[PDB]
Design a protein around this ligand. Structure first.
Ligand SMILES: Nc1ncnc2c1ncn2[C@@H]1O[C@H](COP(=O)(O)OP(=O)(O)OP(=O)(O)O)[C@@H](O)[C@H]1O
Ligand SMILES: Nc1ncnc2c1ncn2[C@@H]1O[C@H](COP(=O)(O)OP(=O)(O)OP(=O)(O)O)[C@@H](O)[C@H]1O
Lengths: 58, 98, 289
């Protein structure tokens, strides 16, 4: 990413309640209710998988 | 329980695209287009110096509905990838939101 | 010894499970709102991300809600505690918490021993494991987590001699000046002592001095959602586990780990509390010793 100038592939994962099902490294989130946004995302450290939630206000 | 992936817009893809380029330029990100449904975006971190990066991929989920997707890239550390991700995604979504 | 050596030779990484959830709050969150998020997510604490400092600044734990409830109380504003909406940020700043008690954390690569000293030296109950490369809190280390892991080894390996001696022989646990309440005691009193003494739980005892229950910090804040009430009255808004000095270290550990509790109330033949044995107690004696 070095510049500041300007058939969408179909999507089969979309909503959730195993890891690939969640897609490692992809942003997930909840319906923003009551002025608070919840993000989630799963990452790998070596052999381990942490699914991190961030509770954020707007 | 109701965990939605990325964000869902219904505006036209090219439009959508521009909206994001605009946001990003406002949010003061620089990007590299990889194609009209994928961009690699980057953000300098002023306190840190280091950059944070992520991938935008547009999808179609219906015929009248779309889905924009965010993906991450690469004594306390200065620099917190997962948090800087979340923050980068948040700022955009807010910028877009309104 | 052998347990000490085990702990100097294992990385915190080692007891991180394969999958794990970590809930983080932005310190710009509303204490009140956070409290619910702790609850809905079924966790007792959370890491605090401070967006402006661009960092993890510490933990939101039950003591922090206690410290705040107390302030309202000291101000005769207890009626308001329920209703307020100051940010976590605000209150931590009130106490200059980030500058005075800065975050204590550890590397995935540090020894389990190191983590045990860490928690004890700093008198804390939670310890963030943070990848120094990425800056990501991988997972949070508790005494219970640390002990449970060690117990697996304990059982699959020959015990030392002293693992058979008794609490009394070993002199493990706290037996002087036990903070306890009485059936009748005013919740507000417990508050007072929680704040002043830095213990987690209080044995509820009868006139004879026998343990009938236990009041925790949680119980206090849980209520606040009047305070002159009977500890006993409050408890109608909801585990006590016993042990004796005749009991062997080994027997104790098994119960503490298998049982899921965070401490045992030591008790004589007629249930008259004599002391408390906790996880720090266990883990200090096995490991730091
Ligand atoms: N890693 C840490 N770094 C800095 N401060 C911490 C850390 N962990 C906890 N604290 C602080 O220490 C105080 C005591 O919390 P601690 O977790 O030790 O006991 P607690 O309130 O009973 O919580 P818990 O349910 O985890 O026992 C709180 O003010 C908390 O914010
Ligand atoms: N009601 C009490 N009165 C006096 N001392 C106590 C009481 N409860 C615990 N202690 C002692 O105070 C120290 C801290 O105990 P506490 O249970 O708060 O910490 P811990 O057991 O290390 O943490 P955790 O409960 O997470 O294991 C321990 O050494 C324990 O023996």
């Amino acid at each position: 990413m070095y510049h500041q100038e300007p058939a969408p592939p179909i999507l089969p994962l979309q909503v959730i309640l195993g890891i690939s099902h969640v897609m490692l490294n992809h942003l997930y989130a909840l319906s923003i209710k009551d002025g608070v946004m919840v993000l989630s995302a799963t990452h790998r450290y070596k052999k381990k998988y942490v699914t991190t939630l961030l509770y954020k206000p707007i | 329980a109701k965990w939605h992936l990325g964000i869902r817009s219904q505006s036209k893809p090219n439009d959508i695209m521009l909206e994001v380029y605009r946001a990003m330029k406002a949010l003061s990100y620089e990007w590299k287009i990889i194609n009209p449904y994928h961009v690699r975006v980057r953000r300098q971190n002023v306190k840190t110096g280091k950059f944070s990066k992520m991938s935008l991929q547009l999808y179609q989920v219906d015929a009248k509905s779309y889905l924009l997707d965010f993906k991450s890239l690469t004594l306390q550390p200065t620099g917190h990838h997962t948090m800087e991700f979340f923050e980068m995604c948040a700022a955009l979504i807010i910028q877009l939101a309104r | 010894s052998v347990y000490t050596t085990f702990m100097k030779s294992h990385r915190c990484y080692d007891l991180i499970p394969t999958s794990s959830k970590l809930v983080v709050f932005d310190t710009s969150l509303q204490v009140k709102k956070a409290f619910f998020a702790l609850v809905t997510n079924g966790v007792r604490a959370a890491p605090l991300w401070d967006s402006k400092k661009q960092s993890f600044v510490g933990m939101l734990t039950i003591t922090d809600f206690i410290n705040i409830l107390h302030r309202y109380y000291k101000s005769a504003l207890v009626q308001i505690y329920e209703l307020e909406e100051h940010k976590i940020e605000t209150w931590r700043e009130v106490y200059l918490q980030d500058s005075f008690k800065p975050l204590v954390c550890i590397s995935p690569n540090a020894s389990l021993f190191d983590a045990v000293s860490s928690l004890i030296r700093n008198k804390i109950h939670r310890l963030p494991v943070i990848d120094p490369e990425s800056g990501n809190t991988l997972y949070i280390l508790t005494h219970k987590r640390i002990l449970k892991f060690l117990k697996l080894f304990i059982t699959e390996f020959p015990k030392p001699e002293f693992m058979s001696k008794s609490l009394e022989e070993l002199q493990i646990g706290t037996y002087a000046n036990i903070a306890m309440v009485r059936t009748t005691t005013p919740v507000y009193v417990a508050l007072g002592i929680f704040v002043q003494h830095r213990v987690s739980a209080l044995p509820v005892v009868d006139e004879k001095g026998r343990v009938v229950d236990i009041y925790s910090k949680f119980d206090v804040i849980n209520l606040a959602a009047n305070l002159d009430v009977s500890v006993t009255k409050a408890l109608q808004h909801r585990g006590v586990l016993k042990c004796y000095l005749h009991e062997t270290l080994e027997a104790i550990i098994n119960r503490l780990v298998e049982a899921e509790v965070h401490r045992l109330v030591v008790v004589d033949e007629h249930d008259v509390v004599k002391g408390i044995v906790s996880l720090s107690d266990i883990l200090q004696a096995l490991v730091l010793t």
